[model samples]
Target: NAKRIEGLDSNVWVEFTKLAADPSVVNLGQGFPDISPPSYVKEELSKAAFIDNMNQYTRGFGHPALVKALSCLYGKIYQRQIDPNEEILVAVGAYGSLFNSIQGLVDPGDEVIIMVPFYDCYEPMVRMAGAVPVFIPLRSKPTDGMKWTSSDWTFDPRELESKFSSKTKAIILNTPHNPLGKVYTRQELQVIADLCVKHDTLCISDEVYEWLVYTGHTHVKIATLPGMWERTITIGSAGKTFSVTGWKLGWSIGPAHLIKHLQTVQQNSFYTCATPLQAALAEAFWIDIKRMDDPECYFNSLPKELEVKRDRMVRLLNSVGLKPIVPDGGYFIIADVSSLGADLSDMNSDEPYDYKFVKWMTKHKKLTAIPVSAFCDSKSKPHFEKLVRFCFIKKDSTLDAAEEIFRAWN
Candidate 1:
């Protein structure tokens, strides 16, 4: 089990959970929603288990119904016709698909470029595949006054281009990004598209939070960009879309040539996902497509509700001397903790400062959060240490309770 991994021991969420497991700690670390799935989706599950035959193994790739529904729905959204049989493969979750894709494609010494403040799994996944992770951080630009925006994080094209070389295999792109919640603009995506095309590298596009856009920001599918269709593996999750993290249903879409290799990796690792849940997801997908554009639908209403919660958290964090990076989308926000008199000297002494700050926060404040440094490679650690990420996807009452504690303490 102790096979060599170049950059394996880097995760802050697990450390946050260990801190939150203490009896007095309040968790704001993980990005999972502390709410239930939509009522209609749950109802469909009940209907599928009782009224329909969905308990047996459906297929290795995915249940026929599920694949068809996904094809139809994605076709409508992306305005591109997708073949259900050839292009789509339903994996256990987006995490599973991500693992399979990396293990299948990457080789030893191959380089996989990832943006900094990334989802933590990208590093280990690349290393497990014996690939190197080339990190490029989104640089913060000067902002005006108190009106903070996600647009403050911008990527330098030259810097990104410099990361690509003959050894470069692929890049992971997360729109409606985690931690900083910076949604990549269309213009930015075009620049990425040109690079991927020029380098002939694969794109592992993680769009799990595709439905959680807020504040006039839209989640763009990288696979839809020019010259990206054949080279990109677009991953989506039903749990994120339907607000049921436990469902564990996710799918990937791309050209058959690339996906077939991933299929080999999936079959070798975990052959098939739960059958009944796939059936239930199929029913939900069919119904959701019909109401996808309607405001009354949960897919539409969920983001609207989250936008309100995002603003509330921003206000609360600001009141407590923490300057939050106002998220444009996703369920996460990164707050700058530099004003709290935290010293970074100890952070550089053997252990990471982020680990120390989060541990201290959990023990003293009884509040837990993931340090932003966990998302970056060691090279980018110093610049990212003063920030912590918080999830605002809890129920209204839960968020209110956290707010009460923060307000009283401040």
Candidate 2:
């Protein structure tokens, strides 16, 4: 009697990841680091497993070491004090934190505003929480010749203001955003902050890619902006930070009044995270912050490395007649494939243009990429259909292999 929920339909990444897993396909689709976690972090995890008492369950909240480490590091970066016990909750990946926050706070029929070109998980999570997803697209207009910047996506403050009502529960903000990789400016964050304060709305700020900023753009924590601290749930991930997606360690920081509810949901759903990982993450947090600004540090080196990869992918896509939008931050770049001109006149077809195009590329070209339209709600699907996303977070050899395929196709 249980069919897939109306809102949960398809995931572009799942489709692309499947194509990628095939040995014959060169994957440029998923945004996962192809490197190991920094040696220091790995060593600590090894030590915890064999040399320390981390094999057992930590306190249901989090390991003491992790809570303290997160509080200290986040306090410095966010420019605010955070209580280790009350303000932070470590969870199994930022995905889990996102689920707990929505399930804990959003009630049936509550409308949650989701910016379009959002992380694919948001809509289903909202529906699973029995809330309606209200979509606001970041409209893209033409920019400089053959090159587009995410700055092209701008929000109307008036439209955002009109969306909030008594039944409105929250807004999802992904800075150093996914898919588009648009890092919200401080002034933009101020506008969002003012709205949250005005409407008494909560904010789920997903900043997992907080460290991948490029092109001289700095990642600004929205909670640091005026009037946003109390109303925002700031989510962070060690997976993105330390190049260890399999570690799946993540944390959420917010005011206790709101976070307490999330903790309840967390306890009921997935009680706690892996003890050894949390302990090792605690060590990673402390050690990494000291070298945060140093170019030699993996955190600093990661973006520098990814920036080169991004440029290479842009050139490769351009060679294939796909014009790429250069991103200022994050691991992805969106390319417009309108130049390819494949026949997509069928309106009754289940697949959108981007989807059909990607499927063709994967099956024929033996290359995988995610369709950008999959990130949007149905209402915004038409406008986003011409674009597809490529992830640059691959090993140099992996990227080189994809480049070779593109060159052969050309």
Candidate 3:
């Protein structure tokens, strides 16, 4: 009903996830895991629900215990002591954290640089803040017969630099990026950090999939780069970290000055988050921070587990003549569907190829995936129209079902 929400009613996840809801479809559309979260965290949640004052309101910015645990956990990673009271703001999810950052700091008409084929919500959030979104695409590089990986998809530094100006408020950086899993190398992050330093722009670093990086890759937090932490708000997700998307917990870590503004946004909007969830996450972090170096730690082990799924998904897509761009991190794999050569005569000609293809596949092939164009701007959508995104965080049986569908389709 508001001007900010106008023309933002449509969402790719909402549209495609409806199709994926059919009982007969093997869903690979959404980016949530189908597996169980660790037993320790679940046990903590169960214990927390009945604890004294755990279900009621706790600290407005974040639960005190959770904030302390988060500060300790991230402090070790960033090699700096983080003040739990001043440097952290916990919210409903990374989604809410993003909302708080944009709405709190960005003024109307401010330009936010958003990479193409992003997580989809960033644009709407920018728009809702009355900010203009400046688009930059991550174009593919020719590998010259070498296998294609997510590293192949990158933005030109010159082109990216061109997007920043005096009116630029921030740049939304997604490492272990979505749809196309391009982990920002420390070198790549340095390029961005330099631009942010030069332009005096804030970096809203979305590292929700920070721990999901695959072999041959590392996740670098942009905030950790020199001169960047003071100008960055690094967001992380408990749901993503723990494989419990339904928990709806996330946080932002930054300098006190910036984090305080984000806290203001949370105080006005959400006030506080679920106390039981926070308590549970706090206990989990206390246990996890100690075992982080151990190979058996979920932070270390989940990536190892998902890498197998990543390889299997790569092989599975290849087997069906769908060319997949191998991800360096995260749970998603975007595959080129041009080889299928499906007839689109019955579908609307104006729709993007991937959109039509996905609809047809859902209706006839009894399988579903998200269209890549849904993540891009109008001008950049055409470049990615021949691709569809599939989530590989599903169970092996789910993968088996998808494989069976492919076998039957062939």
Question: Using Cα atoms with residue i matched to residue i, what is each candidate's TM-score against the true structure?
Answer: 0.94, 0.94, 0.98
> In model 2, what lDDT does residue 257 have?
87
Pairing residues by index, what is the TM-score of model 1?
0.94
Q: Which lDDT tens digits does candidate 2 get at residues 131-226?
A: 889998887666866677777777888888888888888999998889998989888888889888988899999999998999769899988887
lDDT of 3 by residue, 166-279 (tens): 999999999989989999888889999999999999999999999999887888888988899899999999999999999999999999999989989998996999999999
Off by over 4 Å in 2: 1-14, 144-146, 343-349
Task: Report the Cα lDDT for candidate 3.
Answer: 0.91
Rank the models by lDDT, top first.
3, 2, 1
User: How many residue pairs in model 1 have overlapping backbones?
Assistant: 0
Which residue pairs in candidate 1 collide?
none
lDDT, candidate 2, at 111: 92
Expressed as tens digits, the lDDT of each residue in 25-59 for candidate 1 is 66788767888777778898887787545777678
Pairs that clash in candidate 3: none
Q: Give Cα-based local distance difference scores for all models.
A: 0.85, 0.85, 0.91
TM-score of 2: 0.94
